[PDB]
């Protein structure tokens, strides 16, 4: 429940890069 | 050590900082947020500051080894860099650094 001040703030969450160690 | 970053993969950007980069590219961090998103910048022209996560880029010093065997998050506090919304909060400022020289070119 907090706003943003920066302008370079991301909109979406962390993406999903290849050759990673994460399961879906 | 690590004073720069290098993208090992390309990621489509569509955010406010949407930064379109390519795989295996060089980029220098500038800001950081959620220790997940980092505001880096290319070494081209009128480029950056571009956004880049820590899952699509690696921290290095284009010198030797990789991240000197340290974590990006561990390399952050190292320099104690200010947040993005905190740093950008007001450019008017100045960060200092302690004098330290290593015994390795």
The DSSP code sequence of B8-75 is: SS-----STT-----SSEEEEEEEEETTTEEEEE-SSSS--PEEEESSSEEEE-SSSSSGGG--HHHH
Q: To which H or E segment does residue B78 belong?
A: helix B72-79
Query: How was this one solved?
Result: NMR
Within-domain flag for B8? yes
Within-domain flag for B63: yes
B6 contacts B22 by C-beta, under 8 angstroms:
no
> Phi first, then psi: what are they for B39, rounded to 5°?
-95, 95
Query: Do the chains contact at A5 and B85, CB–CB below 8 Å?
Result: yes
**Total residues found in chain B within this entry:** 105
Is residue B100 a part of any domain in this protein?
no
Q: What's CA B105's distance to the chain center, in Å?
A: 22
User: CA B67, B73, B75, B76: dihedral to nearest 10 degrees?
Assistant: 140
A-B contacts (CB, under 8 Å): 59
Query: Chain B interface residues facing chain A, Cβ-Cβ under 8 Å?
Result: 8-9, 11, 14-17, 31, 33-34, 36-37, 39, 49, 51, 53, 55-56, 83-85, 88-89
Buried b (16+ CB within 10 A) or exposed e, B11-26: bebeeebebebeeebb
> Under an 8 A CB cutoff, do B55 and A17 touch?
yes
In a domain, B101, yes or no: no
- Residue B17: inside a domain: yes
Kindly state whether residue B98 falls inside one of the protein's structural domains.
no
Rounded Cα gap, residues B98 and B38, in angstroms: 23
- Please list the residues that pair with B26 across neighbouring strands: B6
Closest-CA residue of chain B to A11: B15
Contact (Cβ atoms closer than 8 angstroms) between residue B35 and residue B76? yes
How many structural domains comprise chain B? 1
Q: Is residue B40 part of a domain?
A: yes
Q: Which residues contact A3 (CB under 8 A, 6 or more apart)?
A: none
Cβ–Cβ under 8 Å, residues B55 and A17 = yes
In a domain, B44, yes or no: yes
Distance to chain A for B95, nearest Cα, Å? 19
Instruction: List the CATH number of the domain containing B30.
Output: 2.30.30.40
Range of the domain at B66: 3-88
Q: Is residue B66 within 8 Å of B5, Cβ to Cβ? A: no
């Amino acid at each position: 429940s907090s706003s943003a001040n920066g302008k370079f703030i991301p909109s979406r969450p962390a993406p999903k890069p290849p050759s990673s160690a994460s399961a879906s | 050590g690590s004073l720069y970053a290098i993208v090992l993969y390309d990621f489509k950007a569509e955010k406010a900082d949407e930064l379109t980069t390519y795989v295996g590219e060089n980029l220098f961090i500038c800001a950081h947020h959620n220790c997940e998103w980092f505001i880096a910048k290319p070494i081209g022209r009128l480029g950056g500051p571009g956004l880049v996560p820590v899952g699509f880029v690696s921290i290095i010093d284009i010198a030797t080894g990789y991240a000197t065997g340290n974590d990006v998050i561990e390399d952050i506090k190292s320099v104690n860099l200010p947040t993005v919304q905190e740093w950008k909060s007001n450019i008017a400022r100045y960060k200092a650094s302690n004098i330290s020289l290593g015994s390795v070119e």
